[PDB]
Design an enzyme around this catalytic site. Structure first.
Site, PDB file in Angstrom:
ATOM      1  N   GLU A   1      50.557  37.359  46.486  1.00  0.00           N
ATOM      2  CA  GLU A   1      49.473  36.568  44.973  1.00  0.00           C
ATOM      3  C   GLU A   1      49.768  35.568  44.505  1.00  0.00           C
ATOM      4  O   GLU A   1      50.030  34.832  44.647  1.00  0.00           O
ATOM      5  CB  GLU A   1      49.412  37.924  44.327  1.00  0.00           C
ATOM      6  CG  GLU A   1      49.185  39.276  44.424  1.00  0.00           C
ATOM      7  CD  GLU A   1      47.670  38.959  44.606  1.00  0.00           C
ATOM      8  OE1 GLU A   1      46.682  38.408  44.853  1.00  0.00           O
ATOM      9  OE2 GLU A   1      46.425  39.954  44.786  1.00  0.00           O
TER      10      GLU A   1
ATOM     11  N   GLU B   1      45.637  33.859  40.996  1.00  0.00           N
ATOM     12  CA  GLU B   1      46.163  34.655  41.840  1.00  0.00           C
ATOM     13  C   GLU B   1      47.713  34.511  40.748  1.00  0.00           C
ATOM     14  O   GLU B   1      48.731  35.545  41.436  1.00  0.00           O
ATOM     15  CB  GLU B   1      46.793  33.470  42.414  1.00  0.00           C
ATOM     16  CG  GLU B   1      45.475  33.508  43.865  1.00  0.00           C
ATOM     17  CD  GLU B   1      45.268  34.445  44.259  1.00  0.00           C
ATOM     18  OE1 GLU B   1      43.880  34.503  45.410  1.00  0.00           O
ATOM     19  OE2 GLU B   1      45.857  35.432  43.541  1.00  0.00           O
TER      20      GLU B   1
ATOM     21  N   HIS C   1      46.997  38.408  39.412  1.00  0.00           N
ATOM     22  CA  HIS C   1      47.304  39.853  40.560  1.00  0.00           C
ATOM     23  C   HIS C   1      48.839  39.389  40.975  1.00  0.00           C
ATOM     24  O   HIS C   1      48.979  39.915  41.062  1.00  0.00           O
ATOM     25  CB  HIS C   1      46.083  38.657  41.671  1.00  0.00           C
ATOM     26  CG  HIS C   1      45.357  38.642  41.842  1.00  0.00           C
ATOM     27  ND1 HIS C   1      44.504  38.540  43.036  1.00  0.00           N
ATOM     28  CD2 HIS C   1      44.171  39.129  40.775  1.00  0.00           C
ATOM     29  CE1 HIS C   1      42.691  38.719  42.330  1.00  0.00           C
ATOM     30  NE2 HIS C   1      43.042  39.020  41.225  1.00  0.00           N
TER      31      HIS C   1
ATOM     32  N   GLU D   1      42.137  36.881  53.346  1.00  0.00           N
ATOM     33  CA  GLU D   1      41.296  37.229  52.457  1.00  0.00           C
ATOM     34  C   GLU D   1      40.502  38.200  52.994  1.00  0.00           C
ATOM     35  O   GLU D   1      39.741  39.479  52.841  1.00  0.00           O
ATOM     36  CB  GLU D   1      41.024  37.328  50.899  1.00  0.00           C
ATOM     37  CG  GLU D   1      42.440  36.473  50.200  1.00  0.00           C
ATOM     38  CD  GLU D   1      42.018  35.710  49.704  1.00  0.00           C
ATOM     39  OE1 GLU D   1      41.183  34.064  49.750  1.00  0.00           O
ATOM     40  OE2 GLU D   1      42.688  35.402  48.107  1.00  0.00           O
TER      41      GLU D   1
ATOM     42  N   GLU E   1      37.755  38.915  44.041  1.00  0.00           N
ATOM     43  CA  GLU E   1      37.889  38.079  45.648  1.00  0.00           C
ATOM     44  C   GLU E   1      36.739  37.493  45.807  1.00  0.00           C
ATOM     45  O   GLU E   1      36.346  36.418  46.517  1.00  0.00           O
ATOM     46  CB  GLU E   1      38.457  39.602  46.189  1.00  0.00           C
ATOM     47  CG  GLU E   1      39.354  39.398  47.697  1.00  0.00           C
ATOM     48  CD  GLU E   1      41.108  38.292  46.900  1.00  0.00           C
ATOM     49  OE1 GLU E   1      41.475  37.345  47.935  1.00  0.00           O
ATOM     50  OE2 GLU E   1      40.907  38.631  45.881  1.00  0.00           O
TER      51      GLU E   1
ATOM     52  N   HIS F   1      37.280  34.025  45.226  1.00  0.00           N
ATOM     53  CA  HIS F   1      38.256  33.813  46.693  1.00  0.00           C
ATOM     54  C   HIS F   1      36.935  33.369  47.771  1.00  0.00           C
ATOM     55  O   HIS F   1      37.678  32.812  48.555  1.00  0.00           O
ATOM     56  CB  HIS F   1      38.997  34.497  46.694  1.00  0.00           C
ATOM     57  CG  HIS F   1      39.710  34.746  45.226  1.00  0.00           C
ATOM     58  ND1 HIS F   1      41.010  35.001  44.914  1.00  0.00           N
ATOM     59  CD2 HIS F   1      39.327  33.776  43.917  1.00  0.00           C
ATOM     60  CE1 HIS F   1      41.534  35.347  43.601  1.00  0.00           C
ATOM     61  NE2 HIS F   1      40.089  34.519  43.038  1.00  0.00           N
TER      62      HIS F   1
HETATM   63 FE   LIG Z   1      44.615  38.207  44.836  1.00  0.00          FE
HETATM   64 FE   LIG Z   2      42.572  36.044  45.830  1.00  0.00          FE
END
Ligand SMILES: [Fe+3]
Ligand SMILES: [Fe+3]
Ligand SMILES: [Ca+2]
Ligand SMILES: [Ca+2]
Ligand SMILES: [Ca+2]
Ligand SMILES: [Fe+3]
Lengths: 510, 388, 166, 388, 71, 88
Positions: A97, A127, A130, A192, A226, A229
């Site tokens: 992360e 991030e 996270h 991911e 997510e 991303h």
């Molecule tokens: Fe993440």
């Molecule tokens: Fe991510």
């Protein structure tokens, strides 16, 4: 005078025009690609609205953690094995992360279109979010759980062991070191889209199964971010699809990214799941095939086929090496248990049945070895035995892949067993596969990571553990243990008496 | 089904029983404090510090790192993932910095979300109360739409100047601070556009397109040197600290503070504009929040480093001299905007006094911290030359 | 005294570094150190476990001396060896664009880092070079990345195959 | 202990097993919607309505009640706990009211809490940014401390005017709205004091004591008629609806909206004051919020009651005329305040333009609603006559 | 120019002086007792701080309810 | 529909608002809250937890946090009239 305001999409409408032209308006990073100036983003967010939606998620998350979950003593009522698994799962993901922060900062620098830059930016912030979330899981388990050691200092105690090195390859350096596009593939298109998105959910399942409601609360919240991303990674391919260089380099960068991620997560994830739990959710082998093959390798990657993207050429070898990889690795992790920041356990009778049931032939190989180690007294401090000793007595050297950092024992492994040893300019190098071998041969200067045997050579085991603070608060008991019971914990003295001295296994070659 | 199929170990009788049976009588360690090994900046370790410090996996060869060994995968050519080579500044420990506001992700988005909702309520009450009636048309359509509008590109450029630091910062605490300083800048640029969009809704004929403000920024005279400076700070600076330091401790502290506070905020009220000052209040709060962090990193940690104090001050003095010239030029071109105002709006004495306020605050909050010898009247006199 | 973070080797170099009191001496020692202990082309691997840390201590000294010796303009635009940084950058980039193959290219990029890594060259010019040199190096390297068989690639790299298992 | 001694039915194996064994295979009723019998004001029933409507236990003899019978305990004399006798207004259903903002306790304190924290950051930025420098010494030390401060007692009085309604309101939805209208008023009064307390911290000689501003309100000429009007609306009205209607749809809509907007807000900037306007923004956002509620209750509900429309309008038209005079008087006495402003500050042209803005808005939002034909010119002239 | 603000206590300090005497300034409800006009309250709260302390409790509560407890 | 509701209204509705304000204060804060609700709210969460209900504890415990202030109001009500001869 009718009450009116303005929303995010109404401002985002003009975001693309924010950037302007000037001679030096270009990326500061090296790359073989050219991101289209007009590339657009999937979500129309602005700083204020991004903050609001994340703040809403935080309230539910922290509210659940501080109130109901604490009143329920949720930090304690988890299986001992899972409490240990989360020390590794949460802290390791934390670094992925964290690096993803620097990774997306670099992609944001690469993108020339204001909208594409903005998509990356939202991830940079996510991030950081996270990193702090993963940190909170360890922070919470350290504060309210059955064993804070490791949860409370993983950021420094993870450095003692070999499993950490590989983690930095796929989720640290793999995310920020190289062509920005290569990094995007390691992080978003593969990292991911293939492993993280399905993994995060899978983790919440194994967690709930083992009594852990802390992780589902935080990770399910992480999962909600997510999608955006995923789009960034997808938009990365779009932005460079109409560039001549794309057809020349895209598939090569993708194949490397794919092997890099799979090489580490295929054995490590399966290992933490099956060996780091009491209650099983699903056999790793089938979980893998669905993720890597079906979902990603077919459905998700197929969509980007119109952009030149093809299925990784090492995909077939990855499958052939997957089936036993995690089983092969746990043997090594347990043998080297004193180098960890968590407690490990031998498979119990019910577990062995499950293993044999789902992986025919498991018992005749691994089962018997574990039974032997138990007889040698691997769980008892006064035995003077560490599984590592067994590898020595039976001439089973353990090597470290120079590229992936994944430990391997070619003479014992049921999966891959192709050791390659080279000498170059006064240094010995050991590889476990033909893909990582090509990587080093082509890019020697990118892979100079010293392995634990090289760094620890000639050092007595207990001295390394002591120097790197691998002890509990009493200053004597080891954080790592070969069993998950509450009594008969090994002390530094128990290890010192073993007088185990590390040796670089590659020095035997002439 | 009402109960569902998935059995959970916390509530499932059989599974919970197995779990409870394996638990120890008490915790296997009494030290239940994550990050207990981190040296606290304040009396006791904070949640901010525990969740942030050492998240960055630096090895000991990058000042302050706790890991060992090289990175696992480097760039083609050999450049390390993170390394000392990315900045001229040196220190005994890159993890010493502390955001005085102790902002980790949760507190950061919480505050910004509150501001977002307050803003929405404000605009609804502003439009419902019909305050737009008392705003001078010329100020609205010329100075707010074109000139305040053009300034969004200035803030946008400063936002982008942070991209490389996001990638290269040598510690978690610095990365997080830098990221938040940058995010607040893009926010301000978006609030300038938000205001224009709001005006397009409550004012018949007001065009929210950025074409005009953008044409002013890219081809006008008032912001020519500001744009040249921003283009440089953003794309000609590869050193992540030179970038952050020069943006916040030189350019934005002088040019930015002058434009936002001594021009628009100071004159908006005179034209019946209570709208722009609302958004400038936010930008100024953000500026003051960043200043605390910038001061801690560059003065408290680097400029006062027990081993590299002298070295770091020499470097920052160098940077200040390098960027002070382009910043003065930016202020000098901006002086041209005063001639566009209706006669009697302000005069040379007010303009001069306001320049001295900005220069004096800068000398106190920044220049003096590294022993940079700034001459306030010389700086002001150079800028006033731009008055038409 | 042999340890991971603190040992006799590191101590011995700290002492050696404390005696580099002039820029030219220190800068030369730093460049020599990089030739002897860094990259896969290093003259030897004897300091593999401590060179990274030692190099940073050496850099620290060169930086402090350069800041005291150079006027403001030279600190921004000249290398520790007194060369014009822009010239060195343009010159190296020129050579890179003239590289005929990936093998010539890696030599140029790797050699550039060994000789000019900060505090030798100012960071702004060095990272601008990293940007340009790294781009060309990758372009040459990733073209037909898999066409050459391992058997032949091992020979091109020039490794000595010690042990092969299948 | 690590596990504690208290066993919980949700997690204890034995207890949970017993609980699970007693559960039905499926819910015993599919209608899982609480308040499903409530008539939605909008498309679908809202959380606001479900949680509020019918909480008040009124019997059917009180228009809208769902219960039956008399109260169980009444006042000495026989006066009912709640009754139709506490207000002149009549309706087919007291539960028809709906706050347009749909505020129940949670959303209410969330919004105000955000504002409290926003406010704190603002003041911290304002001070650090030294914006006080552009503040005209006269304006702050005389017009804010004395006249702005004295106004706090005006808001405090309107606040207290809500006390009886807090007890007599004939429904939950009206009680909640009422309570919030009054709570916001005390908030404003407290924000006036807060600003004065802030000034005291950043202005050496500034005294925050209410001594000065109070003496003015109690023994002053500017707010003399104001205080007299407030004392009436508060302690002389025993009808909870007359109090709420007259205070919000008459006195505060005219006098309050002029003193707050057309004076302090319209002139504060001119003296280098962006502080006072920050808080007035709140008072105005709050005013616009309460206005949507006051309109829904007295116009959309009562004013347009399917059976008492005419009757109620007559009662409100009556109330309007009753308090319109005391209000106009409050304004007159307020006019004499301009004479104390430094010559040149404002002329009789503006003062007239502002007055009409207030009066006009009042007519478009309230008067025209109950058909209270009022003459804008006559009113303005009557107030304008106060210009000393 | 140090960052400065004002808390609830600092404002509540002057709350008691908010009420002024006059004609009908008295209760509208029948009662046999007389409450001292100088009575103090134990908690020095203002509308804005009151809202904040309650909003914080709400967050946890509704957070637990909508998330973990529902799961 | 039921009879238990009538008595509830007597103690927690009409007993709270109908009569001398001071008598209402005693029914609400001095007795109701201080003697019954304060302990009751906590007891309810205890019986709730024993029966598997974690919903009620989450809400009722939060309500409980507010009772300390209401205790004060009731206590302050008596202090406010302690000097008036009518009190005795
Ligand atoms: Fe993440
Ligand atoms: Fe991510
Ligand atoms: Ca040899
Ligand atoms: Ca010009
Ligand atoms: Ca003048
Ligand atoms: Fe109560």
């Amino acid at each position: 005078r009718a009450p009116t305001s303005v929303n995010a999409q109404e401002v985002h409408r003009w975001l693309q025009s924010f950037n302007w032209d000037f001679k030096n308006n270009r990326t500061k990073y090296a790359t073989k690609y050219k991101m289209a100036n007009e590339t657009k983003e999937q979500f129309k967010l602005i700083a204020k609205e991004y903050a609001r939606m994340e703040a809403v998620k935080d309230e539910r998350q922290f509210g659940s953690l501080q109130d109901a979950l604490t009143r329920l003593n949720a930090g304690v009522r988890v299986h001992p094995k899972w409490n240990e698994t989360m020390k590794v799962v949460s802290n390791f993901l934390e670094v992925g992360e964290y690096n993803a922060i620097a990774a997306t900062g670099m992609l944001w620098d690469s993108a020339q279109a204001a909208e594409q830059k903005n998509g990356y930016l939202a991830q940079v912030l996510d991030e950081i979010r996270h990193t702090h979330q993963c940190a909170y899981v360890n922070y919470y388990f350290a504060k309210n759980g059955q064993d804070p050691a490791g949860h409370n200092d993983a950021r420094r105690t993870r450095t003692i062991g070999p499993l950490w090195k590989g983690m930095k390859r796929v989720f640290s350096d793999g995310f920020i070191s190289g062509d920005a596009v290569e990094c995007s593939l390691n992080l978003q298109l593969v990292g991911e889209a293939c492993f993280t998105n399905p993994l995060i959910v899978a983790v919440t399942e194994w967690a709930a199964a083992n009594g852990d409601e802390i992780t589902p609360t935080v990770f399910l919240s992480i999962e909600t971010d997510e999608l955006r991303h995923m789009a960034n990674g997808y938009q990365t391919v779009v932005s460079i699809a109409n560039d001549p260089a794309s057809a020349k380099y895209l598939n090569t960068d993708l194949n490397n990214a794919f092997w890099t991620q799979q090489k580490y997560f295929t054995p490590v994830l399966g290992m933490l799941f099956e060996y780091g739990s009491k209650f099983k959710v699903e056999p790793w082998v089938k979980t893998w095939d669905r993720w890597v093959y079906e979902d990603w390798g077919g459905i998700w990657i197929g969509r980007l086929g119109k952009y030149g993207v093809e299925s990784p050429r090492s995909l077939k070898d990855a499958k052939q090496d997957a089936y036993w990889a995690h089983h092969d690795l746990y043997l090594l992790a347990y043998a080297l248990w004193p180098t960890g920041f968590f407690r490990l356990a031998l498979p119990d009778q019910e577990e062995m049945e499950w293993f044999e049931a789902n992986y025919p032939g498991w018992y005749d190989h691994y089962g018997k070895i574990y039974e032997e180690w138990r007889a040698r007294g691997c769980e008892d401090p006064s035995s003077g035995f560490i599984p590592l000793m067994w590898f020595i007595e039976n001439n089973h050297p353990i090597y470290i892949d120079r590229v992936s950092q994944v430990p391997f024992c070619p003479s014992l492994a049921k999966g891959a067993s192709t050791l390659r040893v080279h000498e170059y300019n006064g240094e010995m190098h050991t590889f476990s596969d033909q893909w990582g071998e090509r990587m080093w041969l082509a890019e020697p200067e990118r892979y100079e990571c010293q392995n634990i045997f090289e760094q620890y050579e000639g050092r007595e085991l207990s001295e390394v553990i002591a120097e790197l603070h691998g002890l509990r608060s009493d200053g004597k008991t080891l954080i790592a243990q070969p069993h998950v019971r509450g009594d008969k914990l090994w002390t530094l003295d128990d290890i010192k008496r073993l007088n185990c001295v590390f040796k670089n296994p590659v020095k035997a070659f002439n | 089904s009402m109960l569902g199929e998935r059995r959970r170990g916390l509530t499932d009788p059989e599974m919970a029983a197995v779990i409870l049976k394996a638990l120890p009588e008490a915790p296997l360690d009494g030290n239940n404090k994550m990050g207990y090994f981190v040296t606290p900046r304040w009396k006791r370790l904070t949640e901010y510090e525990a969740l942030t410090v050492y998240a960055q996996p630096n090895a000991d060869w990058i000042a302050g790192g706790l890991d060992w060994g090289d990175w696992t995968q480097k760039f083609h050519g050999g450049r390390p993932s993170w390394g000392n080579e990315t900045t001229e500044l040196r220190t005994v420990d890159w993890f010493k910095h502390r955001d005085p506001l102790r902002r980790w992700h949760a507190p950061y988005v919480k505050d910004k979300a509150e501001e977002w909702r307050y803003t929405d309520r404000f605009l609804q009450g502003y439009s419902a109360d019909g305050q737009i009636r008392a705003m001078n048309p010329t100020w609205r359509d010329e100075f707010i739409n074109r000139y305040w509008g053009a300034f969004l590109f200035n803030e946008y450029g400063l936002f982008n100047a942070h991209s490389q630091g996001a990638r290269e910062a040598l510690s978690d605490v610095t990365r997080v601070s830098l990221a938040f300083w940058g995010f607040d800048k893009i926010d301000i640029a978006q609030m300038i556009q938000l205001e224009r969009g709001f005006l397009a809704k409550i004012v018949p004929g007001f065009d929210e397109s950025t074409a005009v403000p953008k044409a002013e920024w890219t081809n006008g005279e008032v912001y020519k040197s500001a744009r040249l400076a921003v283009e440089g700070l953003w794309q000609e600076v590869f050193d992540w600290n030179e970038s952050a330091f020069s943006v916040h401790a030189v350019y934005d502290a002088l040019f930015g503070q002058f434009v936002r506070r001594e021009f628009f905020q100071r004159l908006a009220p005179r034209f019946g504009d209570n709208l722009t000052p609302f958004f400038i209040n936010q930008a100024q709060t953000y500026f003051q929040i960043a200043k605390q962090g910038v001061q801690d990193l560059y003065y408290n940690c680097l400029g006062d480093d027990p081993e590299f104090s002298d070295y770091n001050r020499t470097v920052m003095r160098n940077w200040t001299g390098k960027w002070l010239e382009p910043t003065i030029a930016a202020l000098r071109d901006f002086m041209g905007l005063f001639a566009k105002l209706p006669a009697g709006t302000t005069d040379k004495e007010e303009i001069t006094a306001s320049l001295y306020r900005v220069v004096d605050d800068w000398i106190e909050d920044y220049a003096s911290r590294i022993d940079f010898k700034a001459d306030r009247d010389q700086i002001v006199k150079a800028v006033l030359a731009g008055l038409k | 005294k042999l340890g991971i973070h603190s040992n006799d080797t590191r101590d011995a170099w700290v002492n050696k570094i404390a005696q580099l009191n002039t820029l030219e001496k220190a800068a030369e020692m730093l460049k020599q150190f990089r030739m002897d202990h860094t990259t896969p082309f290093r003259n030897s691997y004897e300091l593999d476990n401590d060179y990274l840390w030692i190099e940073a201590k050496l850099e620290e000294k060169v930086a402090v001396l350069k800041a005291r010796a150079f006027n403001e303009v030279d600190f921004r635009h000249k290398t520790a060896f007194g060369e014009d940084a822009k010239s060195v950058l343009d010159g190296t980039v020129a050579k890179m664009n003239a590289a005929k193959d990936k093998w010539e290219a890696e030599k140029i990029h790797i050699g550039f880092r060994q000789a000019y890594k900060p505090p030798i060259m100012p960071v702004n010019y060095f990272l601008d070079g990293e940007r340009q040199l790294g781009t060309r190096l990758m372009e040459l390297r990733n073209l037909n990345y898999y066409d050459t068989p391992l058997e032949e690639l091992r020979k091109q790299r020039g490794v000595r195959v010690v042990h092969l298992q299948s």
